[PDB]
Design a protein around this ligand. Structure first.
Ligand SMILES: C[S@@+](CC[C@H](N)C(=O)[O-])C[C@H]1O[C@@H](n2cnc3c(N)ncnc32)[C@H](O)[C@@H]1O
Ligand SMILES: C[S@@+](CC[C@H](N)C(=O)[O-])C[C@H]1O[C@@H](n2cnc3c(N)ncnc32)[C@H](O)[C@@H]1O
Ligand SMILES: COc1ccc(-c2c3c(C4CC4)nnc-3ccn2O)cc1
Ligand SMILES: COc1ccc(-c2c3c(C4CC4)nnc-3ccn2O)cc1
Lengths: 380, 380
């Protein structure tokens, strides 16, 4: 009845995550001046370079040099000794207006509630009662390990830490009538960029004592837990110098860590008309509402859209055997309580608010009581 | 007992797919001269630009201008009237050597069989008996609709077609003791870039009669099937001009269309030491072997790795209730028959061969009898 499951997370200075945070800093900069900005901002990061590529139609006057550099400063890349510096890096901009063919097919001359989906696609929402925040323990732990590294770097406890990090947690679970119960942590991996002065044994000791023990409850750790701490042996070169980063290359870290399902769409750098983001947020909101509402212990929701069409093409619900109600009954409850048109989701989840940079590291779900994390009281 | 499931696919000229094909053309160019090339090539595409960013350490002498332009020519972007031209686009190169810290931790001075995983991560393999190729019908149909568009464009039947396309198929399934049985096609979406001369009604008629009817068996289509053909109403601007493309932004199209599970890793532009590709291919090979071997009707395999470590950290198997054997029994069969170290997978699946550009459109699985699609005869 037991099984293993592994999830990973990355830190704020992982090059792909730098890109997601810059793309969302650009989106927020536009939304601060024009709540109806149409934004599709991709970011690429490599040694010394941030390139913005995409499409933006907006009435805002945005200083891209300032927005980009301020986001890199927040992450912690502020000196050539760290491999990247917000003060002196190259910021290249290849941004054009949104395609008029897309604009006419999606939102031009359309009533806001009846705007079409900004693209076709499929999206999933997932929730599990295994944690209070309704997220898998594997991904919650993996995110908290990266957050702890950033905390210890920023407070000066471990001054040899640099912003680029990755973590991975394998948990042994027990099956329980469709639901899952965490038993113990089987393996933890941590890799983090570091300075040239600190030795490997000092790093491994700190990662176990000051990071793992500060995040993972002792009840999950035992004599058999496997630790792979700094397994490469050396990680001085890091950030964009060590590996090219792109927006939307950490979509499983952004969501459920492999649990549930994913439709493929990236979140960062997109306004609400892009259903890859808004409909995934709404699907998480529906899933969490079904679990917090006591209708299921674990649930998966799929929705799909066609470009230019407001209503979803399909809606499906899988309760893993954890509900007394059938899928048909749960779908009827969802139809009575939710309107999954993008032009209505924007109002329910306040998606013109410039809070997106906050979502772009540590996962979009299970944190900080964002609107999609506040369950809706269901009427049925 | 019935439910809906939707998957999507994209064409060869979808901007993200252009990037995956260019990244894999670069990898193949290196492997043709140096089978041990270390390649991590990301591609970005926007109006008039192909940018290569990443890390390559190789003994090959590669003409990036020629490799990139030949890949774009193959896709069909050969004139400014189409929005992109291989002859006149800008090709920018930001490629550096692989980080020496990664090289020392992964493969330097290591016996090939004992090379470490090129990164940490989680990967899944999936197989389903619903089609002979062991793939979900939703994604098989979605890929075939894009392939039909490219065929009709290349043979001159529909000369108004351009290379950028997207498709989406929703199938109504019946549950069958853990396995799934397709009943009918509920909805199809097709969007394809076109010239300025053809009218919307001519395109919609051709998409139904020459594309859908030529791909989807009539037994799946009925009076209630919903068609969204050219739903945006106009798609003249397309390819990188209409939307920025990046490598590794179609990872669900590349795999199972939402079925099974995904660990987040992209495939294109990476050599075998990057377990995001090799271990996902090996996991598909294990899953397909378990289904074709008669041990299950549907199966999901998860594997995970740590950078620098050769053996997987975890292996898990979920048979959806379609096997008489337990997960423990299936894991023992997998341990007896497979060695999932990257340095052994490379030999079993011939992963130094330059066939990667062929994998970069229409899915990596369920096609063309690649080594990971030829089931292993299991001994137990
Ligand atoms: C190992 S790199 C990816 C492979 C790389 N593109 C190559 O050229 O081999 C992927 C991520 O691992 C982390 N990383 C980079 N250098 C590392 C090192 N020396 N040891 C461990 N992890 C490292 C960074 O977070 C980086 O974004
Ligand atoms: C709709 S675009 C993505 C949104 C876009 N970045 C924006 O600025 O709104 C995504 C994909 O849809 C397709 N596409 C582009 N223009 C389109 C159009 N006019 N109608 C339908 N699909 C289109 C292309 O395959 C493109 O890569
Ligand atoms: C996509 O989300 C999932 C999540 C979990 C499971 C799963 C198992 C697995 C997965 C390969 C890791 N292995 N043993 C399992 C036993 C039960 N359950 O539920 C299946 C799918
Ligand atoms: C990730 O792969 C999957 C695939 C399919 C299912 C699934 C259902 C769904 C999903 C939301 C679409 N809806 N009704 C369902 C009934 C049965 N089964 O099996 C669950 C998970």
């Amino acid at each position: 009845g037991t099984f293993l499951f592994t999830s990973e997370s990355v830190g704020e200075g992982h090059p792909d995550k730098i890109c997601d945070q810059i793309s969302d800093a650009v989106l927020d900069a536009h939304l601060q001046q024009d709540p109806d900005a149409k934004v599709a901002c991709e970011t690429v990061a490599k040694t010394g370079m941030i390139l913005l590529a995409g499409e933006i139609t907006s009435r805002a006057a945005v200083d891209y040099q300032k927005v980009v550099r301020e986001a890199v400063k927040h992450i912690g890349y502020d000196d050539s000794s760290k491999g990247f510096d917000y003060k002196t890096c190259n910021v290249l901009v290849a941004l054009e207006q949104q395609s008029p063919d897309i604009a006419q097919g999606v939102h031009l001359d359309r009533n806001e509630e009846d705007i079409g989906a900004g693209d076709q696609g499929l999206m999933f929402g997932y929730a599990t009662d295994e944690t209070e925040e309704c997220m898998p323990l594997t991904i919650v732990l993996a995110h908290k390990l990266n957050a702890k590294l950033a905390e210890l770097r920023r407070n000066g406890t471990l001054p040899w830490l640099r912003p680029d990090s990755k973590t991975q947690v394998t948990v042994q679970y027990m099956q329980d009538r469709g639901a899952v119960l965490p038993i113990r942590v089987h393996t933890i991996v941590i890799s983090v960029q570091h300075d040239e002065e600190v030795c490997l044994d000092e790093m491994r000791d700190a990662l176990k004592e000051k990071v793992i023990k500060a995040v993972v409850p002792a009840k999950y750790l035992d004599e058999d837990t496997i630790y792979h701490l700094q397994p490469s042996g050396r990680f001085v070169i890091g950030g964009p110098q060590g590996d090219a980063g792109l927006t939307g290359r950490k979509i499983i870290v952004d969501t459920y860590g492999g649990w549930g399902a994913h439709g493929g769409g990236a979140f960062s750098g997109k306004d609400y008309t892009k259903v890859d983001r808004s409909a995934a947020y709404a699907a998480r909101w529906v899933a969490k509402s079904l679990v917090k509402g006591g209708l299921c212990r674990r649930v998966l929701v799929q929705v799909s859209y066609a470009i230019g069409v407001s209503h979803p093409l399909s809606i499906s619900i899988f309760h893993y055997g954890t509900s007394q109600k059938s899928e048909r009954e749960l779908l009827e409850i969802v139809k009575k309580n939710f309107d999954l048109r993008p032009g209505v989701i924007v109002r329910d989840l306040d998606l013109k608010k410039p809070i997106y940079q906050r979502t772009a590291a540590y996962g979009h779900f299970g944190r900080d009581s964002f609107p999609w994390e506040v369950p809706k009281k269901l009427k049925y």
